[PDB]
Amino acid sequence: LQPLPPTAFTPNGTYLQHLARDPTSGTLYLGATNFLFQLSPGLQLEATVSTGPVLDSRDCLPPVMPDECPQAQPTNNPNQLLLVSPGALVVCGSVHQGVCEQRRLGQLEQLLLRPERPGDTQYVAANDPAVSTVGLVAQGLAGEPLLFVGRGYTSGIPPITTRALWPPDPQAAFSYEETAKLAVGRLSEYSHHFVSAFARGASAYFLFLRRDLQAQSRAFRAYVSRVCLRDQHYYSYVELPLACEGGRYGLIQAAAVATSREVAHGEVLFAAFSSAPSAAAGASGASALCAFPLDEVDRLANRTRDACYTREGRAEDGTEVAYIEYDVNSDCAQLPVDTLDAYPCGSDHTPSPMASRVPLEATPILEWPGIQLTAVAVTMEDGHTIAFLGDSQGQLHRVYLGPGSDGHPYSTQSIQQGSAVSRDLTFDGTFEHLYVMTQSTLLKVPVASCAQHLDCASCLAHRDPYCGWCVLLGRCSRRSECSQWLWSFQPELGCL
């Protein structure tokens, strides 16, 4: 049982698509239809920017000119990508073939970088609001910021590109070089659908669905793929199928690593999956949370790279575990063991792009029927890992993932009934609030509300791992506030 959120932001006359937090300042940036918003941590506006609508047509290339593109009409610009970078906000709409721009952090109304005459290596985001775009900011071997972009197919732009944010010639911004791409023949048939991008260590990782054209089924399947964070070709690119309860929950929806004061980015990816590209809606559907240690992702990908480079795609027992994907003219090789160290990210003579026949397997930490999860955040309190999970019906569930749990949520709260929770769920600086976003509103939700129980008995009855009874203070609180504390989740003592 949870109170009404204390703070809301709701834009008049528009829908929300993305949220980005600047951790230096805590400033929130909101990408909406025809809008960009800059918000204080208390969800008060600092800046509003109009991004639309614009004269446009998907059959025309920008600049869109009336006398030159007669069928262009005003076109609404829902936001496709919103990312904080070392010196700029990166902004991509769906209008004008997905071109991007860069704006000043803390002064959103100030344009910093925008190519005036973009070419066809600078069409970044999906120019269809139905289709999803994901990105990742990272640094190249020289410190130059790079934009990794995961772009689903629109009714021929590489599904994954590595684009330069600060090229020395400013007119080249957001373009990828010839080889800084995943070259895929049949885009429309693979039909990538991207869910998230994240960096860890020396690699960039993508989570997506795509048809398994290699197998007989040609079914949509979940993948994690990994590429060297500075290999500005895709020599190191390797794909792994993702199995949650062996593929019963086939469609990956959202994912996050643990984030808290104790660790800014944990080592365990918590992915939400749904049974089946959309999940079954209503009672028929079911969702699962599967945890994958990133070190397991890296071992399977390593083994896959090692088999393809040095054993013609074979595991040590002679079984066929790695192959070349996307119909690219390339084969697994028997290169000298030497090349594993020489070329950790590959070269122009190493097999590419690689994939595993062997999936990464995980057992659900929760199976929930009739719930379609759409959003995952994970944090830690007094050492306990807690998951915050949003669903398609606008519900936020809080879940204890520690030992002894059975996967039931210890709290469910209605946020905006019927409106999917955005996967751009993220915490504030102190991990005291969750920023929950739907298509309609941005709410600032306190991770717990122990103070609402004024008596020991009610404090302990309403079980919540954040909360316990502080005897000397006589309050219901988090442990950290209790300057003897009876944990409501498992109380050492009673009130008498």
């Binding site: 199995a243 083994r303 397997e361 057992t363 930490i365 520690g402 749990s405």
Partner: protein
């Protein structure tokens, strides 16, 4: 998880073929195969009654559900008790392995039996023991036991 326990039945009183085949069904790594072989040769040197008493201990132990360990953020698929038996046998002191057995109330026979196993396992090198750990973690997430 039947298919895991005949991995255990065959480790302790059956042929290396039947053991290797009980292990192979879990699609093990190659690091797990050499380390599974090194352990089997040590389990072979044990006289029969130690192994028979070990099987009763091993199967008396024999619940699995994934959780995240407190403070560490670690993923364990198993039970804290089982994890404790796993790590004290393969990576900690004989005394700590002993106390982990005492959770399951063994009799003097299983005690002295398990103590021989622990004495033996400690002769393995570091990395094979670690592989045997990654092997039991593999078994729990296998879509065999579920």
């Amino acid at each position: 998880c039947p298919s895991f326990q005949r991995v255990i039945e065959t480790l302790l009183m059956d042929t290396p073929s039947s053991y290797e085949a009980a292990m192979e069904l879990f699609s093990p790594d190659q690091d797990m195969r050499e380390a599974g072989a090194q352990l089997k040769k040590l389990v072979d040197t044990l006289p029969q009654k130690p192994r028979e008493s070990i099987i009763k201990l091993m199967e008396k132990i024999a619940g699995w559900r994934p959780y995240i360990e407190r403070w560490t953020g670690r993923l364990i698929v198993g039970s804290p008790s089982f994890q404790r038996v796993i790590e004290t046998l393969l990576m900690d002191t004989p005394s700590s392995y002993e106390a982990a057995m005492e959770l399951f109330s063994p009799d003097q026979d299983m005690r002295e039996a398990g103590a021989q196993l622990k004495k033996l396992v400690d002769t393995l090198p570091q990395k094979p023991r670690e592989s045997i750990i990654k092997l039991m973690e593999k078994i729990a997430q296998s879509s065999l036991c579920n």
